[PDB]
A paper describes a structure:
α-Amylases (EC 3.2.1.1) cleave α-1,4-glycosidic bonds of carbohydrates and oligosaccharides; Hence, these amylolytic enzymes are employed for industrial starch liquefaction and saccharification. GH13 family enzymes have three structural domains: (i) domain A, which forms an N-terminal (β/α)8 fold (TIM barrel) that functions as the catalytic domain; (ii) domain B, which is essential for substrate binding; and (iii) domain C, which forms a β-sandwich designated as a putative saccharide binding site6. Here, we present the first α-amylase structure from Anoxybacillus in the unaffiliated GH13 subfamily.
TASKA-M was obtained through co-crystallization of TASKA and maltose, while TASKA-T represents TASKA in a post-maltotriose hydrolysis stage. In the absence of a substrate or product, the structure of TASKA-Apo reveals that the active site of the enzyme is occupied by water and solvent molecules, whereas the structures of TASKA-M and TASKA-T show maltose bound to substrate-interacting subsites −1 and −2 of the substrate binding site with each subsite able to interact with one glucose subunit of maltose. The subsite −1 ring forms a π-π interaction with the side chain of conserved Y100, which is common to the GH13 family. Comparison of the Ca2+ ion binding sites of all three TASKA structures reveals that the side-chain of residue E110, which interacts with Ca3, underwent a conformational change in the TASKA-M structure relative to TASKA-Apo and TASKA-T. Two water molecules exclusively found in TASKA-M interact directly with Ca3 and bridge it with E52 and E110. Notably, E52 is not involved directly or indirectly in Ca3 binding in TASKA-Apo and TASKA-T, whereas a conformational change flips the main-chain peptide of Y51 to allow the side chain of E52 to interact with Ca3 in TASKA-M. The cause of this conformational change remains unclear. Structural comparisons also reveal that the carboxylic group of E110, which directly interacts with Ca3 in TASKA-Apo and TASKA-T, adopts different side-chain rotamers and interacts with a Ca3-binding water molecule in the TASKA-M structure.
Residue numbers in the entry: 26 to 477
Write the structure that this text describes.
Amino acid sequence: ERTWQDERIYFIMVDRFNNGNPKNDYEVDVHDPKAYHGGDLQGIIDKLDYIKEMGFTAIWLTPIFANEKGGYHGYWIEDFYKVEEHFGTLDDFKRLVKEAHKRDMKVILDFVVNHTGYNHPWLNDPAKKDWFHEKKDIFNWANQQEVENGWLFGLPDLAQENPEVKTYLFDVAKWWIQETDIDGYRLDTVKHVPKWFWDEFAKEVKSVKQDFFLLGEVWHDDPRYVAEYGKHGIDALIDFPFYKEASTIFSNVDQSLEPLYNVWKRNVAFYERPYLLGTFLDNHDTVRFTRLALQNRINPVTRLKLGLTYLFSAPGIPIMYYGTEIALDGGEDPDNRRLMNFRTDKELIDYVTKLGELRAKLPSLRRGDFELLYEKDGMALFKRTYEKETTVIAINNTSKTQKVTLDGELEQGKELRGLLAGDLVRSKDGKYDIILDRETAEIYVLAPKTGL
Ligand SMILES: OC[C@H]1O[C@H](O[C@H]2[C@H](O)[C@@H](O)[C@@H](O)O[C@@H]2CO)[C@H](O)[C@@H](O)[C@@H]1O
Ligand SMILES: [Ca+2]
Ligand SMILES: [Ca+2]
Ligand SMILES: [Ca+2]
Ligand SMILES: [Ca+2]
């Protein structure tokens, strides 16, 4: 049976992905980094086979609801019940969904309950005076009240305490599910909205579709803070603690992988569903992983191979930001949202393809436990077991050839067959000598000894 633990998510910012219809390019200026660039829903449909062939099983779209002027990213909503006209029509969205489901892919929409756009009509409506919290900045971030009540970046902060507001938000959450048959929501700005609302919200959306999937964006690096939202009806959480370590570690050579293993232990300790954590190297709110490599004056492709191998072999739900597969450069927002280029070399596309194939094929990578066998200054060995399958993941994030001998940590008398790069390690006198050249990786399955 397919569960969310088994999924791999491709993450698309609609306006910056693929312009499949030039006729809806109304305010487009591709030479203005703050304008619409013209990517749309037709462009997504056009690339569903591309996405599926890399092995992704689900797409998360940035919000598609009608935005005010300048809202190319979707987060400045003007009408919760309408598709943004740059992106297409409702009919186009239903067809995207249908086309995704025909290829056995799930669709998650980015969903906003915390705020409206700066210029939403409700702000000039006296009958909606009490739909918004008092207009003030958040200054004390350690006061969770203030975090929940204040206007984030000056965004009008909806007052969920008002039952009219709460009801409008529940109804529109249900409406999209009923109308379009989407598979889940990625919930924006979760920590800015009180926990009691999340419990009710989850009950409401699952009343329409019992298996509806919620993925919460809780922007924080302390997994104790993040984990609490798991207890209020949100199935899965975005793993910022993972990202903080993975982005750093993999964007330069000779750096220890051990912090990632501590992320995992802490995940098991704090979260009720520690495999339902969204893993990533970068996203729409971060400097591009490629750019971190470039800052380090080091080849981004080799960095990406190492980081992606970890992402696709460690616990959680990998989430790959569009463009990762082409080492798309970019600095801080908005430069980390460049239009996708489909006319590049295929080296990383093919690599991702193999990683997604292996994670599909090896249940230990989706469901196994996760042990650390060895880690030294960037040379790492991990082991994963599920029922009768044992895999070993070897990542040499060092600048030299490394030989690491296991002696006891695996059952004697077998061989490790390298499924990513064809390596072969045979038990010799009960020991396995794993040799990796600098900056390479391998994923082995343990299996019986073969021979000529
Ligand atoms: O105008 C503020 C800001 O809004 C958006 O930031 C998003 C961010 O992208 C999301 O992942 C999430 O945390 O919520 C924020 C607002 O809903 C835009 O993406 C950003 O460019 C813009 O500056
Ligand atoms: Ca367009
Ligand atoms: Ca608009
Ligand atoms: Ca709020
Ligand atoms: Ca060590």
